[PDB]
Write a protein that binds this ligand. Sequence first.
Ligand SMILES: OC[C@H]1O[C@@H]2O[C@H]3[C@H](O)[C@@H](O)[C@@H](O[C@H]4[C@H](O)[C@@H](O)[C@@H](O[C@H]5[C@H](O)[C@@H](O)[C@@H](O[C@H]6[C@H](O)[C@@H](O)[C@@H](O[C@H]7[C@H](O)[C@@H](O)[C@@H](O[C@H]1[C@H](O)[C@H]2O)O[C@@H]7CO)O[C@@H]6CO)O[C@@H]5CO)O[C@@H]4CO)O[C@@H]3CO
Ligand SMILES: OC[C@H]1O[C@H](O[C@H]2[C@H](O)[C@@H](O)[C@@H](O[C@H]3[C@H](O)[C@@H](O)[C@@H](O[C@H]4[C@H](O)[C@@H](O)[C@@H](O)O[C@@H]4CO)O[C@@H]3CO)O[C@@H]2CO)[C@H](O)[C@@H](O)[C@@H]1O
Length: 477
Amino acid sequence: MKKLFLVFWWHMHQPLYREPYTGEYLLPWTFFHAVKDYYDMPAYLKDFEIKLNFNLTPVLIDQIQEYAQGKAKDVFLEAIRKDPDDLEKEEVEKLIEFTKLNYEKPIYRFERIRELMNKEKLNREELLDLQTLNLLAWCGRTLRKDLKDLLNKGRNYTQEEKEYVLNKYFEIIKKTLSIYREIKEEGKGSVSTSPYYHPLIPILLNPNCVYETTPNVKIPDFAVSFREDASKHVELAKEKYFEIFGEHPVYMWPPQASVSNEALELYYEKGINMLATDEVILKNSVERASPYLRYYFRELISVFFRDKTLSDLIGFSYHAWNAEDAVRDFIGRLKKIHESVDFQPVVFVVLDGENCWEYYEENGIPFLEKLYSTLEKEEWIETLTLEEAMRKEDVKTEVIESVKAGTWFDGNFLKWIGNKEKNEYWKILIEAKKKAKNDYILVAEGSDWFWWQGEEKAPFVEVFDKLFRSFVRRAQE
Ligand SMILES: OC[C@H]1O[C@@H]2O[C@H]3[C@H](O)[C@@H](O)[C@@H](O[C@H]4[C@H](O)[C@@H](O)[C@@H](O[C@H]5[C@H](O)[C@@H](O)[C@@H](O[C@H]6[C@H](O)[C@@H](O)[C@@H](O[C@H]7[C@H](O)[C@@H](O)[C@@H](O[C@H]1[C@H](O)[C@H]2O)O[C@@H]7CO)O[C@@H]6CO)O[C@@H]5CO)O[C@@H]4CO)O[C@@H]3CO
Ligand SMILES: OC[C@H]1O[C@H](O[C@H]2[C@H](O)[C@@H](O)[C@@H](O[C@H]3[C@H](O)[C@@H](O)[C@@H](O[C@H]4[C@H](O)[C@@H](O)[C@@H](O)O[C@@H]4CO)O[C@@H]3CO)O[C@@H]2CO)[C@H](O)[C@@H](O)[C@@H]1O
């Protein structure tokens, strides 16, 4: 039977929120995505007989480890834990600001949150509800069963109930790396990693790659080499992956799907047998641009190009749909692909694994449960591990000689370089690199810092800037 081969690759990442001089985690996002997504996404494999794959960046792994050991000093989480009588005005303000940032997301759909945000002043009981409902809004699928009664209570929480939630949340974090190891050892999914701090490897290897698809971009004078650092990000990531999973990684996810001829050469030289990237890069690079083939870059490394439409349906569209409409839509598009060719297509669905669900009803749990249940009941769909996709023999292949460098942002680098503010960050990094004395310069090469720079004002951007500049300073000492 002619099957459609479906490959999910869920990419998990957080930049380092731990400020190097105080040791404090200045934003809680690793904690909240750990309790909501990083355990629960692979845990779907306990209940659905499909294959799902995951990327974990090493810098994310480091932070999960620190939280699991009780070593993470998370400033926002300490304000949640406190009795409200001990909250500083600054801490109350940060709690309200965090609530307002998240207020319109369906995971914050508690009538008590709307009441609390319409109040001039908050008393102890109201602040206790504000703290506890912020915790509960990030509840993952597993604990939405354990904590179902607290979630339904909706108000009038006690300090002891809040502490119970915190304890269960840390229990989930402590089991998180173990469940990735478990689904890997059981063949239910493959796990990949990325260069250590999620940098833009093509730019570190050769900043002139930005001209390949944006020839008119203005960038600063890269008067220092980042090529050895690019190698170090890959090598350190192989070491961390070996510690956690017991092999050198043969699959990597390039951050931001970013590839170039030189980056593909580096990954191959470091022992990577397969990566994936974006469909826009495929169309920019070749004329006969089917994303359903396994490509071989210069007969040396395997490359899959994700189906951008399917990936972006989950990432951008379906949060606003009901779950049955969305799953029916997704299956219907898969049927069209299946019927459109006489061979067995390989269909990569690759996107962030933790960022879209907060915009779905009930944290995307009705959608994913229905999607996975429906997929496992379609005979003509076979979901694959990355290992299976790499080695599948009954698929079509093609050799590719050259790619036009870019990312999954429209095949180019403009989200990280090319305006005044983003270029200032590269200038700061370039000068720091000339004076660098330790691996904190690698932390500052993470793509996240440049992503947030030079964008229309938002809460907490000042924190990303404080972190970036602190790592740059620490790198020189
Ligand atoms: O409110 C912003 C946005 O919020 C929510 O989106 C989340 C998303 O759920 C997360 O998965 C993550 O997205 C990842 C993607 O998973 C990953 O694929 C990639 O996306 C690239 C796209 O593939 C590429 O097309 C392009 O995206 C463009 C996009 O095509 C433009 O349409 C425009 O998107 C706007 C949306 O159309 C609009 O609906 C809204 O999006 C919501 C979204 O509905 C919600 O689920 O606003 C956006 C922004 O104006 O612009 C984007 C460029 O940003 O490029 C991206 C690569 O950059 O990477 C993203 C993360 O970067 O995070 C988003 C929130 O950022
Ligand atoms: O003000 C705009 C936005 O502010 C808030 O967004 C938050 C997120 O909710 C946080 O989770 C965090 O974002 C992390 C993100 O969770 C993490 O996965 C990683 O994202 C990378 C991603 O791995 C990569 O593939 C590509 O997509 O780029 C991303 C960005 O580099 O790192 C993020 C931090 O850099 O922080 C942001 C900013 O506070 C708010 O919730 C949003 O609704 C809002 O749009």
